[PDB]
Amino acid sequence: KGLRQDSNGKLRYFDLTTGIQAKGQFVTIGQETYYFSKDHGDAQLLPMVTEGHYGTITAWVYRDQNNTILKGLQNINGTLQFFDPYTGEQLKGGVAKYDDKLFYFESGKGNLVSTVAGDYQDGHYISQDGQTRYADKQNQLVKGLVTVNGALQYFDNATGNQIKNQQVIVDGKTYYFDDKGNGEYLFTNTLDMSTNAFSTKNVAFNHDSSSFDHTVDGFLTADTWYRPKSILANGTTWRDSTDKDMRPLITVWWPNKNVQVNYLNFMKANGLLTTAAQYTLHSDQYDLNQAAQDVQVAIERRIASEHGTDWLQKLLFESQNNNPSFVKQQFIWNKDSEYHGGGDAWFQGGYLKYGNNPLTPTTNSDYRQPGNAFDFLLANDVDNSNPVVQAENLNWLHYLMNFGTITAGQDDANFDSIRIDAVDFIHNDTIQRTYDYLRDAYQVQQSEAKANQHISLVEAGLDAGTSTIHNDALIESNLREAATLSLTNEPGKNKPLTNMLQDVDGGTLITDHTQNSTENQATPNYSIIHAHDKGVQEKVGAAITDATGADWTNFTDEQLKAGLELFYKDQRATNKKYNSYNIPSIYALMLTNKDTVPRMYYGDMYQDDGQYMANKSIYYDALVSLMTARKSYVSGGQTMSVDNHGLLKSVRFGKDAMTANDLGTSATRTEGLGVIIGNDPKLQLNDSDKVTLDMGAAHKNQKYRAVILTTRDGLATFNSDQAPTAWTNDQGTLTFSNQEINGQDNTQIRGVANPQVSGYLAVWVPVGASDNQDARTAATTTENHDGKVLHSNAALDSNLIYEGFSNFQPKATTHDELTNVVIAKNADVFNNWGITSFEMAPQYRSSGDHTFLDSTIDNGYAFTDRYDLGFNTPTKYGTDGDLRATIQALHHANMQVMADVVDNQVYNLPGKEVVSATRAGVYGNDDATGFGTQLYVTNSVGGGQYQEKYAGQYLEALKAKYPDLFEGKAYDYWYKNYANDGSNPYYTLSHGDRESIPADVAIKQWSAKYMNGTNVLGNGMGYVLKDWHNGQYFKL
Ligand SMILES: OC[C@H]1O[C@H](OC[C@H]2O[C@H](OC[C@H]3O[C@H](O)[C@H](O)[C@@H](O)[C@@H]3O)[C@H](O)[C@@H](O)[C@@H]2O)[C@H](O)[C@@H](O)[C@@H]1O
Ligand SMILES: OC[C@H]1O[C@H](O)[C@H](O)[C@@H](O)[C@@H]1O
Ligand SMILES: [Ca+2]
Ligand code: NA
């Protein structure tokens, strides 16, 4: 019966539905909020506070009309809040005492949402019958919803067992308790539905799909409209519904009390309810339900006047006044309930991992195992463990490796080799099976002659254990990381150059430079300093954010232009804020070190403030001189040491001389070279000190000339013997000092700071090379017996890879500026530098969707249709015709051409499905968050025209030609183990067994059953509608 006076005139409250008296609680009645005492249940009016503003102190506070700071409990704008009785500081995510009871104030807005049974500081946790429990000061188990050392926690009432990683309903409120048992309020549940005659008319007409819309896979969403049994025409006259009548579900049913309350308040604010009544989480459910029915009256009147429901679509489901829509204002329907971020959420706010549910047969999977160290990274994660997907990956690989043959009958327009993008993020079985395809197709395992015609690489170091077990592909050396410790930093911030003497990945030796006189011992590797991503994309990103405020993954053509201006001006200065120091030095190491394939980065030679190859960097001439000299001179053994002045001294002996005492051939005399590098721009030698290079026994009493000398303003570069000269002594030693040699400028050793060097750099070669001297070693057809595909020897070291793009290239404004056009035109330039393998950008059409950097600058890594390499309209790089022509031109200039194989993910799939989801990080690890595990509407279905045309088209032919690829197979791989006690990671030999795969199922469009998961989409934990009282999903 509601608010009732007793025989002494005091007010008491009885629940309008149950008749149960309110004691120790707050209730909003009409306009007022009261507290009812826990003893007799007597009313205390809590005065509505209306004027005032939320402020701060040197901590939120609230200030009244006089600007005074409020203390204790306060009824502000239909919520109850608590402010410290002295500080005035607002309580958020904690308890306060009132009427000698504990009430909890939630962490988002500090609103009173519940009662807590007790507050504990002085007990202790115990473990008991395999659970965690908490004992009070009397050693008595504590039960229920409590705070403990300030954390909200829950102990099962029957047993005392602590609840961890669960959503729990307690006294009609829903909370989540994390992996440590620490809790947060989520929402207040509705009590129960109006079961009146009015409500029975609002019931769905039937459970057919025709009666509901904005559904996905038979599930309802927050957007769903439905056909009720009856309609209250114009607010007054019930009639049967027709097939044309639809109303929003959310005008009649709410997932929780917060949304129902917000709904009433929103509708009142938009003129659909005339009342002074206040609607709060302490309103009686009966009154909330009646109010919603009165709103319907006003809704139906406006439907009659307007002859339609479009106004109502806009009112609830679109932004009005640049506010989010009503739906998006609600916690359970926006990203707040998805708990984005965390240390393992590397991109896009983190991830949702797909699982199974009896209600989702079409999105369930028996697979989804990561089969590698990482799992998620970007967009829609492909499930490379699924056998159908493994076959598709073979199909696509075949396509790329025969691209010209397939698309135009042009057999000289095919890719020769691959890069495996994000190799550690895809299942090992698909990597292994890929390598078998290359063995089948090209017989790479047979000899270095075959392997070296198809030099592939992966985006990882020694961690890529399927690529290192049989060295099927190059892995990245540690040069980049080492150089980032000792060379790239500003003065005062580099470590000593002694870290350059050995190439070590987490304590495992890749190669030792100090006295390297052997062959086929090092792990075949590539060496870099920069790539399109590595050491670049976040520094440009930082200049873009500084010059314009834009976020590094999402900006305009015009903000980028501004960032790039600042970036190149900084690149060209001695004192650099965004740019690496000592870039030519690092290249000198890359280009002279033994047992590596160097990879040149396009962006180190050319600037993105111009079109492709238009603007040379400040480093261009030094890098050309080094590539030139490498081709002419670099061969034989190596030595490396760091002297007492901190200088790194590196020598290559020349062809066929492996040690400093070998003579080699008469060819050796004019081969070999020496490099001196320092990282101390203030280096000064005294007048007696010498710096020596021990050129070896083939090089006694010999004239040498400079390739590179350090100058005051830069670097002097020489591509002929017309250069400053110096002589070895009768031991083959070159000697330098703080004086010029024969008065020649820049032949002395001293530290310098200028835009190209911070420390010292000089490179010296023997005088007298013939015109077209070439120090490189051809591969042989000698059969391999050791089980390895690649071998680190003079023939492999003779290769040179060029990464032929940057992320930040501008869009081409003419056909002639298109990357693919310009590459083709300049093919001979790359051949003359000694490039043997041209690594082209990923050629796939960009999704364009701006959800990551890759789909904002359209680099080819973010795509929807992996078969579309520029058909009809060009990619960023050209059309399919331009690509064929590029691959041909490169092939005619004696290069192989590398396909960037991107198996990890697909972007921007428009068709929606419902899948079970949990929050996860890059490792594929479940995150313990308030989202829990929920059915989720995913953007998972699509592909495009070329996928439809080509996917699966090759598999029956492939299985006829290479049946081994479709079988199961046992294999071995190296596995990287981490130690807990701080010592180095160590490798163990793991065994795998890939499954057999079918040839007769095509993936003509992607769908969720072939995916592991998705980046978070912001729909909310409760966008797919269910009964939150029992967890039961609505389904048609
Ligand atoms: O002028 C200050 C403030 O006024 C409105 O918001 C009122 C709001 O203020 C506090 O909390 C707001 C905000 O604080 C943290 O960021 C929370 O985590 C957020 O979820 C929360 O929205 C106060 O404690 C609340 O009780 C009160 O309702 C404006 O809307 C604010 O944006 C503005 O900053
Ligand atoms: O504080 C120490 C921890 O002890 C136990 O491990 C409990 O699970 C946890 O709630 C508590 O935080
Ligand atoms: Ca993956
Ligand atoms: Na090929």
- The C-alpha atoms of residue 938 and residue 381 are separated, in whole angstroms, by 12
CA angle 234-239-243, nearest 5°?
100
Q: Choose the final residue of a domain: 863, 897, 931.
A: 897
SS3 288: helix
Helices 387-401 and 428-442, axial angle in degrees (round to 10): 40
CA–centroid distance, 442 to ligand 4, in Å, is: 8
Q: Are 777 and 798 in contact, with CB atoms under 8 Å apart?
A: yes
Other beta carbons within 10 angstroms of residue 161's beta carbon come to: 18
Q: In DSSP terms, which residues pair with 900 in a beta bridge?
A: 419
Enter the tokens of residue 497: 């150059």
Q: Which residues line ligand 1 (CB under 6 A)?
A: 54, 60, 90, 108-110
Q: Could you tell me which of 84, 104, 90, 113 has the C-alpha nearest to residue 153?
A: 104
Q: Could you tell me which of 595, 594, 547 has the C-alpha nearest to residue 570?
A: 547
Q: Could you tell me which of 184, 114, 192, 119 has the C-alpha nearest to residue 149?
A: 119
Ligand 1: atom nearest CA of 62 is 23
CA–centroid distance, 803 to ligand 3, in Å, is: 24
Same structural domain, 589 and 708: yes
What is the extent of the structural domain holding 596? 477-897
904 labeled binding residue:
yes
Same structural domain, 131 and 84: yes
Q: What is the largest CA-CA distance in the chain?
A: 121
- The C-alpha atoms of residue 307 and residue 584 are separated, in whole angstroms, by 74
Beta carbon of 123 within 6 Å of any ligand 2 atom: no
Q: Are 184 and 157 in contact, with CB atoms under 8 Å apart?
A: no
Q: Are 473 and 456 in contact, with CB atoms under 8 Å apart?
A: yes
Closest residue CA from atom 10 of ligand 1:
109
Amino acid identity for residue 895 in this structure? M
Closest residue CA from atom 9 of ligand 1:
54
Same structural domain, 123 and 178: yes
375 labeled binding residue:
yes
Closest residue CA from atom 7 of ligand 2:
180
CA–centroid distance, 872 to ligand 4, in Å, is: 24
- For 510-537, letters b (16+ CB in 10 Å) and e give bbbbeebbbbeebbbbbbbbbbbebbbb
Looking at the CA of 384, name the nearest ligand.
Answer: 3
Same structural domain, 283 and 416: no
Looking at the CA of 456, name the nearest ligand.
Answer: 4
Beta carbon of 132 within 6 Å of any ligand 2 atom: yes
Residues contacting residue 492 through CB under 8 Å, at least 6 positions apart: none
CATH number reported for the structural domain that contains residue 990 in this entry: 3.20.20.80
Strand bridging mode 101-105 / 703-710: unpaired
Same structural domain, 711 and 822: yes
Long-range contacts of 263-267 (CB under 8 A, 24+ apart): 263/292, 263/326, 264/288, 264/291, 264/292, 264/295, 265/78, 266/326, 266/329, 267/295, 267/298
Closest residue CA from atom 1 of ligand 1:
54
Q: Could you tell me which of 454, 322, 270 has the C-alpha nearest to residue 836?
A: 454
CATH number reported for the structural domain that contains residue 103 in this entry: 2.10.270.10
Amino acid identity for residue 776 in this structure? R
Other beta carbons within 10 angstroms of residue 779's beta carbon come to: 19
Enter the tokens of residue 272: 């659909």
| Backbone φ, ψ for residue 625 (5° rounding) | -60, -35
CA–centroid distance, 374 to ligand 3, in Å, is: 7
Q: In DSSP terms, which residues pair with 475 in a beta bridge?
A: 525
Beta carbon of 131 within 6 Å of any ligand 2 atom: no
CA–centroid distance, 110 to ligand 1, in Å, is: 10
Strand bridging mode 703-710 / 691-694: unpaired
- The C-alpha atoms of residue 272 and residue 766 are separated, in whole angstroms, by 91
Residues shown for the chain? 1036
Radius of gyration over alpha carbons of the chain, in Å? 36
CA–centroid distance, 89 to ligand 1, in Å, is: 14
Looking at the CA of 81, name the nearest ligand.
Answer: 1
CA–centroid distance, 293 to ligand 1, in Å, is: 31
Closest residue CA from atom 28 of ligand 1:
109
Q: Could you tell me which of 36, 541, 635 has the C-alpha nearest to residue 284?
A: 36
Same structural domain, 163 and 306: no
Beta carbon of 147 within 6 Å of any ligand 2 atom: no
Same structural domain, 904 and 884: no
Enter the tokens of residue 758: 């911070």
Looking at the CA of 163, name the nearest ligand.
Answer: 2
Continuous segment of H or E residues that includes residue 977: strand 969-977
Same structural domain, 878 and 905: no
Beta carbon of 577 within 6 Å of any ligand 2 atom: no
Q: In DSSP terms, which residues pair with 703 in a beta bridge?
A: 727
CA angle 353-359-362, nearest 5°?
70
Amino acid identity for residue 59 in this structure? A
Same structural domain, 356 and 346: no
Looking at the CA of 110, name the nearest ligand.
Answer: 1
Q: Could you tell me which of 467, 602, 466, 628 has the C-alpha nearest to residue 528?
A: 602
CA 327 to chain centre: 28
Write the DSSP string, 209-261: GGGB-S-BTTB-BTT-EE-BSEEEETTTEEEE--TT--EEGGGT--SSHHHHH
- The C-alpha atoms of residue 549 and residue 790 are separated, in whole angstroms, by 47
- In Å, what is the CA distance from 743 to each residue of 164, 247, 747, 751? 78, 93, 8, 19
3-state helix, strand and coil shares in percent for the chain, rounded to the nearest 5 = 25, 25, 50
Same structural domain, 616 and 467: no
- The C-alpha atoms of residue 587 and residue 591 are separated, in whole angstroms, by 6
Write the DSSP string, 667-704: GGGG--EEEEEE--TT----TT--EEEE--TT-TT-EE
- The C-alpha atoms of residue 807 and residue 679 are separated, in whole angstroms, by 30
DSSP code at position 777: -
Residues contacting residue 338 through CB under 8 Å, at least 6 positions apart: 349, 919, 929, 931, 1016, 1018, 1019, 1020, 1021
CA–centroid distance, 79 to ligand 3, in Å, is: 45
Ligand 1: atom nearest CA of 77 is 28
Residue of 180, 182, 184 to mutate, ligand 2, most atoms within 8 A of C-beta? 180
| Backbone φ, ψ for residue 519 (5° rounding) | -135, 160
Q: Choose the final residue of a domain: 188, 207, 223.
A: 188
Q: Choose the final residue of a domain: 835, 866, 897.
A: 897
Same structural domain, 449 and 541: no
CATH number reported for the structural domain that contains residue 526 in this entry: 3.20.20.470
Amino acid identity for residue 692 in this structure? T
Closest residue CA from atom 25 of ligand 1:
109
CA–centroid distance, 125 to ligand 2, in Å, is: 7
505 labeled binding residue:
no
HSE-up (13 A, CA, CB side) for residue 815: 5
Same structural domain, 142 and 286: no
Approach to solving = X-ray
Specify burial of residue 620 (Cβ count, 10 A radius: 0-12, 13-18, 19+): middle
- For 985-996, letters b (16+ CB in 10 Å) and e give eebeebebebee
Q: Are 85 and 72 in contact, with CB atoms under 8 Å apart?
A: yes
Tokens 């309609």 label which residue? 231
CA 959 to chain centre: 35
Q: Are 531 and 601 in contact, with CB atoms under 8 Å apart?
A: yes
Residue of 120, 122, 124, 125 to mutate, ligand 2, most atoms within 8 A of C-beta? 125
CA angle 676-494-577, nearest 5°?
110
Looking at the CA of 80, name the nearest ligand.
Answer: 1
CA–centroid distance, 60 to ligand 1, in Å, is: 9
Closest residue CA from atom 2 of ligand 2:
125
Ligand 1: atom nearest CA of 92 is 24
Give just the sign of the alpha carbon dihedral 36, 39, 41, 43. Answer: negative
Tokens 């007696």 label which residue? 688
Residues contacting residue 121 through CB under 8 Å, at least 6 positions apart: 148, 149
- The C-alpha atoms of residue 613 and residue 616 are separated, in whole angstroms, by 7
Q: How many domains does the chain have?
A: 4
425 labeled binding residue:
yes
Long-range contacts of 342-347 (CB under 8 A, 24+ apart): 342/921, 342/927, 343/921, 344/921, 344/922, 344/923, 344/925, 344/927, 345/921, 345/922, 346/377, 346/921, 346/922, 347/377, 347/378, 347/852, 347/1015
Tokens 């957007």 label which residue? 223
